[PDB]
Amino acid sequence: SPGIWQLDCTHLEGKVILVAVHVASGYIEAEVIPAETGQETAYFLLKLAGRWPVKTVHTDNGSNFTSTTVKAACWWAGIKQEDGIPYNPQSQGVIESMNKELKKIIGQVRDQAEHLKTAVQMAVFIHNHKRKGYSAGERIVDIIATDIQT
């Protein structure tokens, strides 16, 4: 569970926002890309795994699950690539709510940035720092630190 991440792809302003969610904490990293390709997803996962101890990734769709480039990145970075089938049905809704929340924050900051990518990173910041009382950023660190002492 400390190593489990979920991929999530959402759309805004004719562009694609690719999100990785650390399932146990709600912590996220995100990027804007022109379109969701295997190459973009692979590069995104490589970055993520160099930054956090990513053991398992629930991929966001079948094309990324199948993609030989995504598979090569997962092999390179030591990531187990799994499907993202919500056998647990509350998973869909949690992701849906996060996309709506992220888009709301993006709208609240949108005017402060000339480019969408900046607004997205501002939203990542606000999301990870928001105290719910611990923040997502605090929860991911504690979960992984606990796991290292083990």
Place this chain on the structure above:
Amino acid sequence: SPGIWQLDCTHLEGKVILVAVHVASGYIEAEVIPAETGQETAYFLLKLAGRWPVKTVHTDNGSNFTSTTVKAACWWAGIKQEDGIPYNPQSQGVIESMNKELKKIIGQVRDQAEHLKTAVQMAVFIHNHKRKGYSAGERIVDIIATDIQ
């Protein structure tokens, strides 16, 4: 000390590699950019601060220290922007050694990637996972977790 980061800019293949080092752990994040501008540096810091609790950044040079865009990003993200003057002189050498190490790793992986940016991220991965025995990734998490409690 858990919140202190250092910016570092190095060059390879006619491009610029921008690095942020978490001083207490040796943990890094890095990106390739065409050139080091205030705008690039500002965006890089915004990303970094959304991901880790960045309290203080020792900027890598006077142009980024002065840059109004870098200052605006630091204000936005709640970062104290300081100079990066190595009043402690072993700081220069530690950064110098890391740049040489990173470039060595980049060379060892260079053939596995079509683009420099990929090789740089592979080097970030290898650097942060390397056991020296804890890894830099393990050290940053422990330092920050200790601080939260």
